[PDB]
Design an enzyme around this catalytic site. Structure first.
Site, PDB file in Angstrom:
ATOM      1  N   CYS A 197      10.280  16.401  21.238  1.00  0.00           N
ATOM      2  CA  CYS A 197       9.578  15.345  20.498  1.00  0.00           C
ATOM      3  C   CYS A 197       9.089  14.238  21.446  1.00  0.00           C
ATOM      4  O   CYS A 197       7.980  13.710  21.296  1.00  0.00           O
ATOM      5  CB  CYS A 197      10.486  14.759  19.419  1.00  0.00           C
ATOM      6  N   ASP A 198       9.922  13.908  22.414  1.00  0.00           N
ATOM      7  CA  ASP A 198       9.605  12.854  23.397  1.00  0.00           C
ATOM      8  C   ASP A 198       8.375  13.239  24.245  1.00  0.00           C
ATOM      9  O   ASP A 198       7.502  12.408  24.530  1.00  0.00           O
ATOM     10  CB  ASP A 198      10.789  12.635  24.347  1.00  0.00           C
ATOM     11  N   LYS A 199       8.323  14.505  24.630  1.00  0.00           N
ATOM     12  CA  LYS A 199       7.255  15.028  25.507  1.00  0.00           C
ATOM     13  C   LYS A 199       6.017  15.505  24.728  1.00  0.00           C
ATOM     14  O   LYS A 199       4.994  15.878  25.318  1.00  0.00           O
ATOM     15  CB  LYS A 199       7.766  16.229  26.304  1.00  0.00           C
ATOM     16  N   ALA A 246       0.701  19.880  27.026  1.00  0.00           N
ATOM     17  CA  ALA A 246       0.597  20.597  28.295  1.00  0.00           C
ATOM     18  C   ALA A 246      -0.670  21.435  28.419  1.00  0.00           C
ATOM     19  O   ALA A 246      -1.135  21.711  29.534  1.00  0.00           O
ATOM     20  CB  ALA A 246       1.832  21.471  28.590  1.00  0.00           C
ATOM     21  N   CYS A 296      -4.854  28.449  15.217  1.00  0.00           N
ATOM     22  CA  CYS A 296      -5.306  27.152  15.688  1.00  0.00           C
ATOM     23  C   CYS A 296      -6.681  27.147  16.332  1.00  0.00           C
ATOM     24  O   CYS A 296      -7.244  26.047  16.441  1.00  0.00           O
ATOM     25  CB  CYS A 296      -4.390  26.571  16.760  1.00  0.00           C
TER      26      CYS A 296
END
Lengths: 388, 388, 388, 388
Positions: free
Chosen positions: B59-61, B307, B163
């Protein structure tokens, strides 16, 4: 850079044209005359005498002689969940159709490409249509890999479409072929009843109807504009298309994908609705062409059931021969959903040349193809036949 | 009857043009910083200390500030099968998304339609796209009903796409608008994570990653060729499209619709594959236009995770500001699958106009839009901005 | 000497084709609305009040706006025997028409020949047709002389034929053109009412009707098979012909050449007989072509009077516009006997080209031409239009 | 009287624009391949073998195929003072160039005015530039009289400018045209090497270099703002200009007018200096325009020698084609000093349209012109090309 120069050079010139048609069905041929016995035994409902008698009537009235089904006695015997009327069985059904839909589409497609005679590397777009199973990447991706198309082929994965979508893929292919210079569209409709097959229920007589009508099959086309003369062989030309929803038909044909597979519901009078709304569709399509004699054109109609066919005929005073090719496919293959209408096209042009008529459309110039299905949806495609 | 006269009279002239964009999200706004607490609690996995930490890292990244979710605590406590990692729950999930996808899409459509300014009776074609749930009649039919579109609007129901399908609906719309004089296409992408939300499992970290990244959203567009000047207002023009499958990507992004709902699998290195193949996609699209400086075009990138954007940026030496619009959407809404890329176009044209730049494409003339998803599939759409 | 080699080398290949049409009428244009006054005055029958009224009715219902007449007041006052109902006058009448028929035909021929564009030395065959006067050498010989045709032009002098012979000369020309390689037939129909004009009599109302309907005119054609493309210009093609005598029509239309000139008798119900037998004529001509929708072909009908057209139209449910070209000719020229039907072809091809329709046959492919006259005889000629 | 009303009404509106370009060279074409033989004989230095070998290398390295020179063998043979390396000869040289400079400028100007197509009486300003000879009244006055311009034409006589002054006349003309409404500036650069031609000296190898590089020619332009649409034909637009002196270049190119004519001294590494300082000039000019890719603009560079060209190219990584037009003029005309850069403009736009590119600037939008000469001076002119 000039976007108009680019647009002018990017687009094709003439009408989107059908250049090859291939079909394919699973090996198991199931005779309609002995189906009620087989069906009621394998779903362990042999004791439901009254219900079975209802089914026997339904089969007899279907005008279907046989159908090809991927589902065999051996497979049904390993899946009791499938033989029940409503048991958790989606995973087992998926596992079957995620593999069978593309497997069957490939045999149809290989035949189509064979007839076309051009390198499969020239296929620039691919439309895949099924009402059976869904997966990611979809059956379009599986078909690209199984057939060896180029990885940059442009794909259109039409899922859970239901029975009007033979008309839908043609409508789609028309715009693809006509707006892109050089484009050759491989269109594949592949339907396998493994997701809708289920045990009988005397309180779900519409679902039972489905068990007597639906069959498996896959049909493929090669569609493109500006065919190369004396190299490619036009069969039929598309000229105009429409799609509409009949008034007062909410719920006529519903289908829901649940843990117990694909259910099927018939909540109105489909043959009534279809025949009540067909004249409107025909005038929208042919008045601009100056034709009003519906016996002067060739016909292709999605055979949801025989009743639709008889009521359309009755309604318009179609000579009985108009629906011949449609009724021959219903007889030998049953309602193959989205692919049915492509089989009919194939049957029509083959009898036409085998019988030495002047055109692929039974010797007539202009013709019409109709798809009928959930919504209640009416798909119209206006066609022009080809000499010889 | 001359088919060439009909064909020339039937088709439009110029480039398919985006004339309006509208977006919508569910009311429930879910902060990412505290998402691990909420998520691990509602799925009863609090005892799973290590796994919780990993999720916190994820979640942080993620570079996502928040997401909008149809699912609420109330809804989740009412559906435990949905809160576990792998329980039978597709029926409960379908019940949710078969209703919410069209509802949310309607919201988006209304906005787009209000901006466009023209009567919704002039919408000739409707593309609906989703990856959450399927039904028959589909969400295209529900939307037709919900918005009061003409019954004869031509529909294209794109289900279970994934997606890259923001790219797919644009490539579809371009051919619909360009081959049809007067056509106005209403394009609606609507994704609801209700079908993929599931409990954590330490042997399935790819699944976990998805619970960190995916969010709900709808975006709608109006697409048409030959805009009525000073009446209709062009935003972007589509000029060229492509779709390809990356080599060596088998299984990179799989998703299966099962009895336990939609599962998500990540079997390769998606950021690596994308960045390794993005350059080929770019020369294919821009060499014919004579552009090789990738910092000289505006950018829209499907943000599967940060990323992908970071490695693409690094690979090509894109200035950091190129992905600004893309990252703003990721930050405020997360990965909204097929709709994401449409939200991005909106953000970029809004900022460009708001900040009085020379064009809707950040003051630049040419631009690129990419969709990444299952296959590994890469969708490419070349766009031209509009002055102001 | 091989007769088969000669035969194969002697005959033409394709369908007899109308390559040019020209018409001519006498300068004296006679308004129908005031025709009763002029007519009753010049024949000294003003005292015949009732009979005058009947004639006024006849003229009013004739649907003829005017006619061109060789006969003038000057000529009539010089010939009282001609102005009475039944006086010795054939000599005076012959003197008139033996000269005027070829003169008027020449006018028509010249026009047709100018349109054709080719040297009149290439005219190999000449058909001349009239119902007014006879002489030896006939009008064919006079016309040969008058136009400077080759002395070896092959002639066919059709005398005393009546109102179906527009059909007759076409059926004759078709065989002349088709059996003879290189043949170009000059077909001339020329009718002058000088031989039938006579005073009114209340016991002979059929005679009176004729004085209300018949008018003077010539029309000429060039007919030939194997037209030289881009040199010669096909208007219509002849494909099939027929001539039949209607059952129960004995004496329906009689005419005798006597010392008092040509008398006209009408002993049955001509409009009734024609309309009662027209359907048989039509299936005979079009069933072999597979056409049964009589509104789908272009029409040329000999307009004996308006009631023939009205009852045929009513009988078959022909749309009103079918008889437009036919009625326009009746309106502007009246019943010009054998030439009428040729004037009609001209009118129709002129309007069709003038109005930029797709074919010379009002945008339609197949057409029918009918001649009605003594016997009761029905002549049928099946025509195919030419693109533009 | 309002000076602001006057100022507002006196000034032009849009960018100063090149509307016509004409060139002219003396008749004597001197081939570079045979020049060393010719030069060393006519300067009676045939015995200076080593020196002549040096000159042969210089010529071979020059990349010049030929040059046009006013000086012929006959003229050189009547002026032994000119053939020596350093003899009193200014009066003889003056007598030649005071006449030849305007004579040559007139042929160039007449061609320019011819292309422009407007009355020469509309020329309001005249810039004349030479580095050869000086007189009072100057060559501007001689050109006014020789060409028939109006006596109130506004004149700017630029003398002893040297090789950067093609850039200088453009810089000047920009302000003249842009600040005066209606102004049409005739710009003439005319250079004749008769003042610098002299015998070889093995201790003056830089002077020798001049003998191998410099050639004669005259180029003329018509410059003005607010061209009349579809009457005048813009070729190139000027947008921004600069002039600067490179650091550490004192003495790089010196030239002194003495009793022995015009000497030429090269005291540094011109190609080194030029290429070391060109990037700074380019960022000053294009950063404000947001362009940093120097291959995305079209190029015009004063070809002092080939070395300058190669070092600039090498330094910036210019594709080899960028300098094509510059290298084609150096090849066919040699270093024509101030006029060279105008010949290059002419060559560029002519190959551009002859090759069917989209713009006069090789199909590119923005371009740069550089003049290099004494100081060491760098002149920059920013240009925008014209469609077609």
């Amino acid at each position: 850079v000039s976007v108009s120069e680019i647009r002018k050079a990017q687009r094709a010139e003439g009408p989107a044209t059908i250049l090859a048609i291939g079909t394919a069905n699973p090996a198991n041929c199931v005779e309609q005359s002995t189906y009620p016995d087989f069906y009621f035994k394998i779903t362990n409902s042999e004791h439901k005498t009254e219900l079975k008698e209802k089914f026997q009537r339904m089969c007899d009235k279907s005008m279907i002689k046989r159908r090809y089904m991927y589902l065999t006695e051996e497979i049904l015997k390993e899946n009791p969940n499938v033989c029940e009327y409503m048991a958790p069985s989606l995973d087992a059904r998926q596992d079957m159709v995620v593999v069978e839909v593309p497997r069957l589409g490939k045999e149809a497609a290989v035949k189509a490409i064979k007839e076309w005679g051009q390198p499969k590397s020239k296929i620039t777009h691919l439309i895949v249509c099924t009402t059976s199973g869904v997966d990611m990447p979809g059956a379009d991706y599986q078909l690209t890999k199984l057939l060896g198309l180029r990885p940059y082929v442009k794909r259109y994965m039409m899922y859970q479409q239901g029975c009007f979508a033979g008309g839908t893929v043609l409508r789609l292919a028309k715009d693809l072929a006509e707006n892109n210079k050089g484009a050759r569209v491989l269109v594949v409709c592949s339907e396998v009843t493994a997701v809708t097959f289920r045990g009988p229920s005397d309180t779900h007589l519409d679902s039972l109807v489905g068990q007597a009508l639906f069959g498996d099959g896959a049909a493929a086309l090669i569609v493109g504009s500006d065919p190369v003369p004396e190299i490619e062989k036009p069969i039929f030309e598309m000229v105009w298309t429409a799609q509409t929803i009949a008034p007062d038909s909410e719920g006529a044909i519903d289908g829901h994908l649940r843990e117990a597979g694909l259910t099927f519901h018939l909540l109105k009078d489909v043959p009534g609705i279809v025949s009540k709304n067909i004249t409107k569709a025909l005038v929208e399509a042919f008045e601009p062409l100056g034709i009003s004699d519906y016996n002067s054109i060739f016909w292709i109609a999605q055979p949801g059931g025989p009743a639709i066919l008889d009521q359309v005929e009755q309604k318009l005073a179609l000579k009985p021969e108009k629906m011949n090719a449609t009724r021959e496919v219903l007889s030998e293959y049953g309602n193959m959903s989205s692919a049915c209408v492509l089989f009919i096209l194939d049957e029509m042009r083959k009898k036409s040349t085998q019988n030495g008529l002047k055109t692929t459309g039974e010797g007539l110039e202009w013709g019409v193809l109709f798809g009928f299905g959930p919504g209640l949806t009416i798909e119209t495609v206006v066609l022009r036949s080809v000499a010889i």
